[PDB]
Each structure stands twice: as C-alpha cells, then as structure tokens.
C-alpha cells in the first residue's frame, strides 16, 4: 500500500501537454500491473518517475543526495538495449552489480549458482561470452535485476524486436516470479494482455 | 581488498584508450615543466643578490694604508674624507664600512678565489647611493681626481643588464605557461567525458542499480590524479635533461665570471613538494567538479 | 563548395570543448616561431663580433696615418713583424677608408659622428690556440680585442634556442595525437551524422571533408593566436631586454618584419601538420 | 554467393539464392530477427542495377545512393528541423538549389502529415516519429527500398498506418522489403514472403 501516487502531475521537460497527469493508482505487494497504452504515447514518460524524477521507507517527496542511493537499491530496472557489453563475460556481467554495493569477495559467489537458473542460464553461461545471441540477452537482463531481493522492478517494452512465440516465455517466466514476494510492473503498448490475468484496471491518460 | 577492488578496472581505462592518456601526460608535463622553468629563474634572480649590489650605489676603492691602521682609521684624513663625502650636495645618506666584513663570505661571493683571499686585499667600502640613476657618470667624473682613492665601481647599466633580462623571462615564461595552463585545465573536464562516451554502459548500469556518493567517480578521479602525477614526473625529468643538456654549457662560464651566485641542480628537488600539489589539484579538483556537471 | 555554413554546426555544438586545441597548438606552432626567431637574430648578431680565434692590434695608429698599404718607413716593419711569430696563420690590414663604412654598415644604430678617424687600422690576425689571449696581446705590446673573454652570445643564445626546440618537440607529438583523437571523438559524438551519409551513399571524400575544413580553420586560428602571442610577448614582456642591448651595441636588434617573413612558412607548417594528422585518423573512419 | 560472418555456425548464410528485383511489395519473414537483418544488410556494405556485391570498389557509394534504407529506430538529429531532416539527403547527392526545393510537399503529401515544417524533431509524436524517416527514404525516386523493421516500436494503429503508407508509396513501382516481428499483422495483406532457415 506504500506504492501509491496520488494527485501527482508532471510534464516532460515542461511541455505544454500535461503528459503524466494526476493518475491515482494504488499498488499492493505483488500486484501485477501492465501499461494501458494511452494511444501509444511516449512510454519513457510516466514510467521513469519512480526513481530520479523531477518507495517503501521513503515517499516521492523526500529528495536528497543521500536519500536516492539507499532507496535505489530496493528497486531494479529492465531496459531495452540490455546494457550488456561484449568486453566482459556473461557469467561475470550479471555479477558486476554486486560490488557496486560492496560485499565480501567470497560473498559474491554464494548467490550466483542459485540465481542463474531462476531465469534459466545453465545451458549458456560461460562459452560464447562475447558472441552472445539475442535470446539470452533478456534472460541476463532479468537476472541482473534479481541479484538483490528487490520489491518492484521496472520492465518497459521487454519484447524487443523478435517474434511473439519466443516473447511469450518472458511473460511466462515473469508470472511465477510475482508470488515469490516481489512486484512486477510492466510497460508495453501491445494487445492480448487482458487475456493473461483477467482483472479490471483503470483508464487514465 | 580496500586498495585492490578499485585498482583492478582503472588500468582497463588506460588499456581501452591509449591515446587520450598520453595527450594528458604530454600536455600536463608542459604546464608543470614550463612553470618550473619559470620558477627556477625567480629563485635564481633573488639568489644573485650575494655577488651584486642593489639598485643604486657607487662602490669606491681607497688606499690601503689609511685603512690599515686601527679598525677603521687613526688619522684625520679618513674623517676629512668622511665629512667631504657625507654632504656631496645631492645625496644625504652614506654608508661607512670596514675591512672586517669586506672579506665577507669567501666561499660564495668569491668561490673561484676561496683559497687565495687575504683579509687585507679588500679595502674599506665607503659606499653611497645616488638619488637618481642618470647621474652615475657625473658622480664618477666628480669623484675621480681626488687623491686617496683608487677607482670607482658603479654596478648599474654596465652589469645590471643581465639581471634585467634575467627577470624578463620570469614574466615571459609564466605568460606562455598560463596561456596553455587553462587549456590543460579544461582538457581534464573532457577526460571524464571521453571516458563516459567510451564507457557508458558501466556508468549507466551503476546508476541504474544504485551508486553511493563515492562509487563510480573514483576511477575517473584516480585516472586524472595518477596522470597528473606521471605528468609532473616526466615534467621534472624533462626539465632536468634539458637543463643538463642545453644549459650547463652556458652557465659554467657565467659561474666562472661570477655573474650568478648559486646555480645548482638541487633547487629543482627543493621545490617538488611545492610543485606536486599544483600539478594534481588542477587535474583533480577539475575532475571532481565536472562530474557534478555531467552526472 | 556550394555549401559553406555547415561546419559551424560543430562549433555551435561545442565552443567550450572545440576551444581546447586552439590554445594548445599555439605553443606547438609558436615555439617553432620563437626558435626560428632567436636563430634569425643570432645570425644577424654574429656579424658585429669576430670568429672563434681573432686578435685586434690598436696599439699604434699614427704609423698607419692615411696610407693604405703598411709599407711606409716604420709601417713596413710593423706590418712585417706580425707574421714573424709562429702562432699565426695569415696577416691583413685595413685602410683609413675602412673605418666609418664598416662602423655604419655593421652598426645601423649610428652612421655619423665618426669622421673616419675614431677607428684606427685593424691589423687583425688569427691564431691556433684560444687559451693564452693576454700573452699574445702583450706579445706585440710595445689592442682592443675581446676574443672569448666573455662567452655569452656564443653559448646562451644557442642554448635557449636548442632548449626551445626540445620543449617544442616534447609536446608537438602530443599535439599531433591530440588532433587525431579529438577529431575521432568529434566523429564519435555524432554517430547519426556519419551514418545517414553512409545510408544515402555520400562520397567518401565529402563525408570526412567538413572535419578537415573545421580542422584547417581552427588550426589557422591557433597559428594566428600564436603569432599574436609572439608579438605581445616581445611588447608587453621583456621591454628593457633587447633595446638596452641594442643601445649598448652588443646584440643586433630585431624588428617585426621577420615575424611576417616567417608567418607563411608557419601557416604552411600548421596546415600541413593538421591535414596529415587528420587524414591519417579519418582513413580509419 | 557465400560468406561467413563469424567462426561458428551461421543460420542466415545458407547460400540461398533468391531474387526478384521487380516485385511490388515483397518482404522477408524473420525467425531470429538478428539473422533477418543480415539479408537486408547484404544489399550494401556486407562482403538492383548491378549483380549484388560482386565487383565492388570505389563505385559502391554511386550505387548506394539508389536503394536507400530506413532503420528500426531513430535515424534522427535534433539540431536541425523536420524540413532540414527531410531535405538533408538531397544536397549530399548533388543537386541545384532550385532542384532541391523544386518540389517540397510531394514527399510530405505522401505521408499524411503536410505542413508545419518548422518543428524540431523532438516535438514530433511517437506514432509519427519515424514518419519523417519514411519521408526521407523516398525523397528522390529509388529502384528498391530495404525497410529493415520499419514498424519498430510503435502502437498497433500507428503500425497499421505506417504499413498502409508503405503499401501506398510503392504504387509508383518501387519495392519495399519489410522485416517481420509478428505473425498477425504482416500476413494480412496477401503479399509474398520467403522460405529460409
């Protein structure tokens, strides 16, 4: 019930359009939400305001340089260009984010072999670390967000540029992650989403 | 651990980009080396006071026998020369000196004659300045012809030209140094920019998962500061080799002709504590501020 | 050549970061100008002095009188006694006519108030070992020669010149590689500008042409501000340096015409260097 | 012809020799997405008026000025305006000043958005964002058009509008090669596809 924005309106770079209007939505723990797709608008707007704008122990009003990094560790994000480099191996590419927080040297490796099979990567983990196909990019992108134990993760347009028969499995794997104790927020301008969970939502633009 | 988790990827910054780093080395080396060249001549000009007189006097040499008695003198001829030289129409203040300190420092003022230097070969000084520098020849014409003195030694506009052109480079090397120094400052602002353009995925991922106050700018600050230190090191090495290769052949005779008192390649190491912090602040504080502008 | 106002788009993108080279190549092209300048003034100043081994005989001048050849009574003996010694090579003399023309042609500071009488006969001679000096001066004393009693213009002017070229070359290479990686990051900061050219099949010359155009214009601005720097560092700094040496008749003066004389050579050096180091790095791109 | 992109098994380079070069609207069905992009990128700068990439050299940019392309996303610059963006690929091929602005709104009359040529490209709507790129793709008359994923990231109504604009702009006699991302829109106009591995 802490994840709730009420009467919050902002515009993209002070545009004349209202952009993100006063949309009142309340998200409880493990409450799946998609994007209603307001005529296919700019989905970078009204999605990136949950952190570093212009969610558990702090609201969206207490802003400071020592307040953003602590509450930025309880939230993850999934992007579109996957932010995966060919200059570092895939087994350690997911492990890059661990030392940014800072843990022990042996503490890094005690969690990788129980998180790299949740999305499924044991068949493709070390060989071909540079020449990596586009199929496992989304798998390593999702696994980058699960190295911690976040509450909410942002996943905007994760279908990429590929056929839907190999895109439905991402939603299929993300469906069984929701009842583990985390909240998944979805953001895509695609149809046949209402036939997945069959729950009535609101329509605000 | 605490000094190794940060040391592992900063070398990959030099490995991934080998051209911009050597640009900062070769440009920061001039902003420190040319400044050191301009500081050495200042520390040489003030050290050239031990063998030169200051802005205006007229050294006069007198006969030894009237100064060979007592400490100063015993006759009335010295007193008569004193009261004649005290007024001298235009001037008002004179200096009376004896032969005790006329030998002065025999290892610095006359290092070429530190052995054969008697205490009686130096007579009394009787030095006096002039109210203006344009009447030196008139005073030398007026002083000569009076019996009891040997010769008059002037030190202005015959020897002081080389001191005038010595300090001329002090306000000339600093100008050329400070013209390109601001370019060396601003280059450090875009060092982090070139590092961010060459490496945006790592900084973006670190900002996405969350970074502390000192999490990801520390490799940029270390890559600036160690480059500044290496630039200072190659700067003082280049200054040493250019001095010992192109300046010793011109300063040996000048030390031999007793025109520069000190001249040594040891004041370079005596100012490097004074020089290293100016090399790293202009590359470190600029990098620490430009990352606030960038991210 | 039809389009001309398109290279200014890069300048309007980064004044504050394109400016980083103009003042940096200024020391790289102006130190060559200063090093050529000191050599140019040294070669002019070498005329008023003598060579490495030389002596002057000004002890007797009434025996010279106004006759050209020193073969008049005692002048024959005074000319014959010069080559009697074994530590000389050749003998020579100057007449009374060679007393005011050489003091006016070599000395533009004053050409009058001499009367061809203040300068006596030369009777100059060269020797082998430049060590005894005073002993050879007193050999015929019975002679205003300087020789190597002071060694300043022989040493420190060439030393500062060779020191100026060394500090130029130790960062000239830094300037050459700074041009290359700077236009490399200038191409890297506009990926779409290059990419839209490659999609529509623009010519390979015209794709890398405006980078070269702004490189020549900005390098020309850099050479210009370096020429201005050498003009101002003579004027504002070191005012009482060369004039008081010129009035002492010790160092030949320098005017501002030789800066203009070396200016097109300096522009050609800067333009050729910048073009060579921009085409070498745009061959890759 | 045959090529090898890497030192592993390539599912795109199957030495498949299929060519039409005169069809109305034919497009490539893509099973992998990345491997479908190599067939579009084969037509220029990989390894028409001339027979594929055979006998290349310095006359490659002469032939790359005929086909043209459109990317999946962006292909944009924000320093200029929309008029400068659509007319930017006219002076780089060589034309008179009267020839460039000889006819302006023919290219904007075929896209459905006409007038208001002074907007910055950042002010355009998301569904009409790549409309300026489609307009730039046919500023002059081409012989082919390799539209590598022209639908891209867009709304389904906007994607249908872009597909209708593509299926209408080739009525002059060009050829537009789409890349497939779905199988419920791109197989709904009865046009030819390809069979490959």
Author numbering:
A (entry chain A): 1 to 54, 63 to 213
B (entry chain D): 1 to 295
C (entry chain C): 4 to 145, 152 to 294
D (entry chain B): 8 to 54, 64 to 213
Original authors' sentences:
The FtsEX complex is a widely conserved regulator of peptidoglycan (PG) hydrolases. Instead, it functions as a transmembrane signal transduction system for activating PG hydrolases. Briefly, the ATPase activity by the cytoplasmic FtsE powers the system through its ATP cycle, interacting with the transmembrane FtsX. The signal is then transmitted from the cytosolic FtsE to the two extracellular loops of FtsX via conformational changes, and finally to the coiled-coil (CC) domain proteins.
Single-particle Cryo-EM analysis allowed structural determination of the complete WT FtsEX with an overall resolution of 3.9 Å. Cryo-EM density provides a perfect description of the full oligomeric arrangement for the FtsEX system composed by two chains of the cytosolic FtsE NBD domains and two chains of the FtsX with TMD domains inserted into the membrane and the ECD domains protruding to the periplasmic space. Dimerization of the two FtsX protomers occurred through extensive hydrophobic interactions between TM2 and TM3, and the interface between FtsE and FtsX involved a large interacting area of ~960 Å2, contributing to a stable MtbFtsEX complex with a robust ATPase activity. The ECD domains in both FtsX monomers presented a well-defined density. Specifically, while the ECD dimer of other Type VII ABC transporters, such as MacB28, LolC29, and the recently resolved PaeFtsEX8, are oriented with their lower lobes facing each other, the two ECD domains of MtbFtsEX face aside in opposite directions. To understand the structural differences, we compared their structures and found an obvious kink in TM1 of MtbFtsEX, which is absent in other Type VII structures. The kink occurs at the hinge region of TM1 that directly connects to the ECD domain. The kink in TM1 of MtbFtsEX alters the orientation of the coupled ECD domain, resulting in a distinct conformation in which the two ECD hooks with the two lower lobes facing in opposite directions. The binding site for RipC is a large groove in the middle of the ECD domain that is formed when the two lower lobes are positioned on opposite sides away from the central axis of FtsEX.
